[PDB]
Design a protein around this ligand. Structure first.
Ligand SMILES: C[C@@H](O)[C@H](NC(=O)c1ccc(C#Cc2ccc(CN3CCOCC3)cc2)cc1)C(=O)NO
Ligand SMILES: [Zn+2]
Length: 287
């Protein structure tokens, strides 16, 4: 009902998944109507980039926010955690151009946010409510918003790989009955060994390891300790979608369905929705 921020400042450290750079992350409370703002504190002047669809850059690997010649790479997992915990306002300070990958999931971030504490603010919380279907497609990929009285995220993947043979590749999460933390937050990012070796040849995925990603070779999951969920891969796609959806700037009242979608198509959906003014409205929980 009311806007939420952090109660205290909290710090964490990690490595950027693509850049491999050590990064210091500081989450800070922020005033009412700030939204989630990334701050590049290594730069003078400090560059603030609100986590909004208009600040997304063209990047095929992850969601990247850009302002001038400055970027903040790989924001989706931390944004998913902000969205999952209903954090309206926060500054996310970074000492480098990439959010740390942590364990590849939103687990460390949801724990970090809860550890900082939650602070109720003196302003009504606003939600973006989907009023009509908005859909984007490209080839076999689709991402759609549908009106829904609540918040629901559906995803389907379809990989031609034996690890995916008979494995859950579709999942739907209705957040009125399911906990973001319990069933989505711990889902780790994943990569196919071929895709990974190719990113490595482009000097990308430098901070990647079996400690922060599920690595799938031609036969099996390489990670010795296995999966956190039988449907971990599709649950991570849901985690990614929730982070991308949070670039709308407010919690969503609606349903998202993704069909082999990724950050590029998710962002195209956000832009089409915003441009389609009659397809959405910004409302309070009471309204
Ligand atoms: C939708 C998601 O697929 C998407 N994830 C990514 O695109 C993504 C994930 C992980 C990585 C990585 C990595 C990495 C892991 C291990 C090794 C070491 N070895 C290399 C050879 O095999 C044995 C191990 C090197 C690098 C790269 C990219 C996402 O979550 N977007 O949000
Ligand atoms: Zn991801």
């Amino acid at each position: 009902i009311k806007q939420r921020t952090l109660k205290n400042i909290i710090r964490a450290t990690g490595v950027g998944l693509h850049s491999g750079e050590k990064v210091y992350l500081t989450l800070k409370p922020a005033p009412v109507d700030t939204g989630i703002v990334f701050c590049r504190t290594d730069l003078d002047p400090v560059v603030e980039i609100p986590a909004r669809a208009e600040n997304v850059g063209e990047t095929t690997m992850s969601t990247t926010l850009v302002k001038g010649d400055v970027k903040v790479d790989t924001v989706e997992h931390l944004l998913s955690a902000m969205a999952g915990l209903g954090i309206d306002n926060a500054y996310v300070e970074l000492s480098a151009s990439e959010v740390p990958i942590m364990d590849g999931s939103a687990g460390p971030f949801v724990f970090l946010i809860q550890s900082a504490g939650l602070q109720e603010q003196e302003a009504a919380k606003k939600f973006i409510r989907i009023k009509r279907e908005v859909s984007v497609e490209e080839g076999d990929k689709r991402a759609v918003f549908v009106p829904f009285d609540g918040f629901k995220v559906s995803f389907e993947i379809d990989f031609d790989h034996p690890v995916f043979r008979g494995r859950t590749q579709q999942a739907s999460v209705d957040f009125s009955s399911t906990s973001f933390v319990k069933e989505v937050s711990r889902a780790r990012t994943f990569g196919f060994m071929r895709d990974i070796e190719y990113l490595r040849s482009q000097n990308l995925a430098l901070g990647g390891s079996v400690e922060n990603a599920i690595v799938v070779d031609e036969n099996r999951v390489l990670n010795e300790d296995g999966l956190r969920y039988e449907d971990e891969f599709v649950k991570h796609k849901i985690l990614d979608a929730i982070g991308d959806l949070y670039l709308l700037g407010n919690s969503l009242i609606g349903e998202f369905r993704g069909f082999k979608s990724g950050h590029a198509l998710n962002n195209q959906l956000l832009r089409t929705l915003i441009a389609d003014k009659d397809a959405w409205e910004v409302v309070t929980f009471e309204d």
